[PDB]
Design a protein around this motif. Structure first.
Motif, PDB file in Angstrom:
ATOM      1  N   UNK A 193       9.086  13.519   3.450  1.00 44.19           N
ATOM      2  CA  UNK A 193       7.592  14.354   1.920  1.00 44.19           C
ATOM      3  C   UNK A 193       8.112  14.974   0.568  1.00 44.19           C
ATOM      4  N   UNK A 232       5.668  13.608  -1.659  1.00 43.41           N
ATOM      5  CA  UNK A 232       4.796  12.790  -1.017  1.00 43.41           C
ATOM      6  C   UNK A 232       3.744  14.476  -1.968  1.00 43.41           C
ATOM      7  N   UNK A 279       5.841  13.140  10.622  1.00 44.27           N
ATOM      8  CA  UNK A 279       5.356  11.719   8.418  1.00 44.27           C
ATOM      9  C   UNK A 279       4.082  11.051   8.336  1.00 44.27           C
ATOM     10  N   UNK A 280       3.610  10.654   7.291  1.00 44.86           N
ATOM     11  CA  UNK A 280       2.803   9.932   6.950  1.00 44.86           C
ATOM     12  C   UNK A 280       2.648   8.471   7.250  1.00 44.86           C
ATOM     13  N   UNK A 313      -0.971   6.800   3.204  1.00 43.82           N
ATOM     14  CA  UNK A 313      -0.780   6.737   1.669  1.00 43.82           C
ATOM     15  C   UNK A 313      -2.856   5.948   0.683  1.00 43.82           C
ATOM     16  N   UNK A 367      12.628   6.721   4.871  1.00 42.28           N
ATOM     17  CA  UNK A 367      11.341   7.624   4.617  1.00 42.28           C
ATOM     18  C   UNK A 367      11.326   7.913   3.286  1.00 42.28           C
ATOM     19  N   UNK A 368      12.450   8.847   2.693  1.00 41.73           N
ATOM     20  CA  UNK A 368      13.181   8.984   1.906  1.00 41.73           C
ATOM     21  C   UNK A 368      12.924   8.083   0.656  1.00 41.73           C
ATOM     22  N   UNK A 408       9.427   6.368  -0.045  1.00 42.56           N
ATOM     23  CA  UNK A 408       8.038   7.961  -1.000  1.00 42.56           C
ATOM     24  C   UNK A 408       8.805   8.228  -1.985  1.00 42.56           C
ATOM     25  N   UNK A 443       6.872   7.049  -5.584  1.00 41.12           N
ATOM     26  CA  UNK A 443       5.736   8.455  -6.506  1.00 41.12           C
ATOM     27  C   UNK A 443       6.432   8.198  -7.889  1.00 41.12           C
ATOM     28  N   UNK A 458       3.481   1.555   0.263  1.00 37.95           N
ATOM     29  CA  UNK A 458       3.416   3.743  -0.625  1.00 37.95           C
ATOM     30  C   UNK A 458       3.771   3.271  -1.448  1.00 37.95           C
ATOM     31  N   UNK A 478       0.050   1.368  -3.097  1.00 37.90           N
ATOM     32  CA  UNK A 478      -0.958   2.213  -3.549  1.00 37.90           C
ATOM     33  C   UNK A 478      -0.830   3.417  -4.879  1.00 37.90           C
ATOM     34  N   UNK A 479      -0.165   3.670  -4.863  1.00 35.61           N
ATOM     35  CA  UNK A 479       0.399   4.554  -5.445  1.00 35.61           C
ATOM     36  C   UNK A 479      -0.054   4.558  -7.465  1.00 35.61           C
TER      37      UNK A 479
END
Ligand code: NA
Ligand code: NA
Lengths: 330, 328
Positions: free
Chosen positions: A1, A4, A319-320, A325, B258-259, B262, B266, B320, B323-324
């Motif tokens: 997160x 995020x 969590x997402x 997204x 997950x980190x 994500x 970004x 992800x 999409x970003x």
């Protein structure tokens, strides 16, 4: 997160982002709410039975905790809901003798409830769902039966809006309902709100509950409903958004997890919906989800008791999901 | 039915992928759906085109070019003169001694002429010189057999031979670690020097083999500005975002965390916003692959260690990061 996006920040130029809560989920989901939302609705504790369970007995403690949480995090609050055919105690419609009360007595009781509740939160709550779900969800009639309607007459809604406006004339007052994009019911909702505005009633907004499925309503139906309602000059809020993994005909109880196909289609569906909301940013001012994460949703027990549903942007571990997204990237 | 990358960026730059004939079949629909440029990952390198003197093996390059042309995709030619993936015969005489400067220039010219003329009209640009600038130290250029035998004008000659073979092609200097300030200034000095001499060098290729944190966005912006101030075309030629920092040789991970996922999202959103900002000076962005089922980073720098560096996952689903990137 840590890296995020924050929902309220991504949509800062478009609309508020809200969640329905109660004191227990504010504790359980506190960090998600703090990180993502800038609006709160009470899921249940501002309904009539949770505020005036007996005549002259007001129980504001749970609602007060929800408002205190919102105000201390600079979140707006939507008040939900004053006059509804559900979750209203029987005392409201009855005399000492037991019989139904008169029109005038029920109006006095409606005015007193509305006045006492709306004045308590004036300056903290900026909008109220004054009438909830008065339009028929089946058949050819405009209006659902209810004791409010039976005892007062069909102008009960006019009166509720006038009483709430007198209690806080700076509030935005809403008509709120579900299945709001199905064309027959959309035309009833439009006709009703048009007729109230055509009499000068202080109805400022339409709340689109958006208790949607993966397939229904179609994107063309949502577009047509947003345009139809905006053409009345009202504010639109999407008030109770969730995207059920089950269509209305699908009453399965056996599924212990969504399939990959459901998860992927839900992601696509939420991207499509948010792209449409962003396209109508000039008329939509707030999007509230009926929850924030899949560890709490009324759809676990409705319309089938005791199953599990996965309707929101965050999973049970907060969590997402794939839907997050796509929603934030429109 | 996702947004198509080439469409999202239609007003900004081409979107490319590195391929070979096996990954064109394994990733065909993703390529058709998303890219308008293709680079051969390996099969237009010298050892894959002229493995022995006078033996040209164009079959694999032809297959990649035919795929591109059949789908309206541009092709970037990669690469004519490089210290890697060049066979030993090139620098040797029959007695195994090093050849002279003049014999090596003849060989360089013959290779470039034959390869560039074959694809003239189909390949619009070429990485003529690859990775000539040094890693470390004060020396501008790395040692190489090309440089040792010919002298420091070997690059000048390669660009003139490529220009002669196709005067309509865009000719690039291509390199990695292109935004580290020390190396950036060498690349600037080198290209500036060739340009002012009148050498037909038209473009700088920024490989963009990057990590989650290096180079910094400020480093990337400075480099884009510094190179653009030369007046050349800029291509991002080999983009990928490794889940590991370069000195992190760890081997314990079987799936991205997950980190990781994500932060990479970004990162890719930050990078594409910056590319878009510099759309006036960047005309193509090619990734060194298209989906995480194929990437050179699975074996470099740690042999047999899986990495997850691209916009689509091993099942060809958008990550992800996808999409970003398209959100900008
Ligand atoms: Na808005
Ligand atoms: Na451009």
């Amino acid at each position: 997160n840590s890296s995020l996006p924050s929902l309220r920040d991504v949509f800062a130029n478009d609309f508020r982002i809200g969640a329905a809560v109660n004191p227990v989920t504010i504790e359980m989901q506190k960090q998600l709410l703090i990180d993502h939302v800038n609006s709160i609705t009470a899921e249940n504790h501002m309904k009539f039975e949770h505020l005036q369970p007996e005549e002259g007995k007001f129980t504001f403690q749970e609602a007060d905790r929800i408002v205190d949480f919102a105000c201390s995090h600079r979140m707006a609050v939507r008040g939900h809901t004053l006059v509804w055919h559900n979750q209203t105690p029987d005392w409201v419609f009855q005399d000492g003798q037991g019989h139904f009360v008169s029109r005038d007595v029920l109006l006095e009781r409606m005015k007193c409830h509305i006045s006492t509740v709306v004045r308590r939160y004036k300056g903290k709550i900026y909008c109220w769902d004054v009438i909830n779900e008065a339009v028929a969800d089946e058949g050819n009639e405009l209006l659902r039966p209810s004791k409010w309607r039976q005892i007062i007459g069909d102008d009960f809604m006019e009166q509720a809006f006038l009483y709430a406006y007198e209690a806080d004339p700076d509030a935005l007052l809403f008509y709120n309902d579900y299945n709001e994009c199905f064309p027959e019911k959309r035309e009833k909702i439009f006709a009703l709100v048009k007729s109230l505005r055509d009499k000068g009633i202080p109805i400022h907004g339409i709340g689109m509950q958006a208790h949607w499925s993966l397939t229904r309503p179609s994107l063309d139906e949502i577009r047509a409903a947003i345009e139809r309602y905006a053409s009345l000059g009202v504010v639109l809020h999407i008030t109770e958004l969730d995207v059920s993994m089950f269509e209305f005909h699908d009453r399965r109880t056996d599924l212990a997890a969504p399939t990959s196909e459901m998860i992927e289609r839900q992601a696509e569906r939420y991207g499509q919906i948010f792209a449409l909301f962003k396209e109508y940013r000039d008329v939509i001012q707030s999007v509230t989800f009926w929850g924030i994460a899949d560890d709490h949703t009324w759809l676990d027990n409705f319309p089938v008791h005791g199953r599990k549903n996965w309707p929101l942007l965050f999973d049970e571990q907060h969590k997402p999901k794939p839907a997050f997204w796509r929603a934030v990237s429109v």
